[PDB]
Symmetry: D2
């Protein structure tokens, strides 16, 4: 009766800025379409303050993080997590009425 | 990646109590698990009073209503309709990770 | 714990082609991004066969149809209906864990 | 326009029965409404047998597991995880019509 097709997916976790400084980024440090540190760059003090200036409290993390395929990072808070799924939800009213009738 | 297993379904619509009184119900007149008048029975002034006392301004309407299998009624306002789907949304994190890669 | 933001919505209903011929379209007759008859045009035999050639068994109808704000049309099957909602579903894992903990 | 009222939630993960035997459970070992071993109890060879006989290859894991409040265990495979959200999806047809206009 209801099909749910995933078009995109993103995981976000709370930044711990005090642990990010000096890391070499293994994935782009980004939020809301803006990349603050490119993969392979070492995070500078300015990068930290640029995130802060923009009010970036959550950053993107690879979705694979949630199935254990990314070694855990001290610069995100493990007690947090926001999963955003963009989907096309197809609801058959006919099929629902048939569930209801039965 | 995401399955949506439907366990129950209903519409809800705003009630126009003036137009209900005197009619014979074609579906249970119901809200929040309480049935006020059963299908096949006449709606009394007492029923109308009970609905008002309980503050019932929306009632359940079968999803069949939306595909014409239950015919239209004056005492529910189609402009106000809601579809409530009770479901288990089964999200495969493995599948989402696969999609991300 | 879960927010569901609607980005787009479409209603589709099964076409009854035998009742569409000769109608003056009051909304574009379309499916899958292709407009077959523009609003205000009278539907010709060719339009019917063009829909058929493309296998168009369902057409778009204004969503308002489902709240009774479009007078019913004999050229769609009233016993049908497919509602497609494009949404951003935001799932707070933290909030869900808190529901679970409680 | 759409509210998603959560009524229950769990993860599920693939079980590695060899790594469970002998451990003391920190959450009920459970599938499809049957609890095999309660939180705080040791998993026996008999428990392992029961799981196998019932064909239980995925078990429930608390959502707390995903935010670190329940610590990681060798006997569930995080690569396989699912999140199952039981909810009432309340779709306002009035609101969808409003959005369409």
């Amino acid at each position: 009766a209801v099909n749910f097709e995933v078009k995109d997916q993103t995981l976000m976790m709370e930044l711990v800025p005090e642990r990010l400084r000096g890391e070499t980024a293994t994935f782009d440090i980004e939020a809301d379409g803006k990349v603050y540190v490119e993969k392979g760059r070492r995070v500078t003090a300015r990068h930290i303050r640029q995130l802060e200036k923009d009010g970036v409290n959550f950053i993107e993390v690879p979705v694979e993080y949630i199935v254990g395929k990314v070694s855990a990072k001290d610069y995100v808070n493990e007690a947090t997590g926001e999963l955003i799924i963009t989907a096309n939800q197809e609801i058959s009213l006919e099929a629902l009425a048939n569930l209801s009738q039965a």
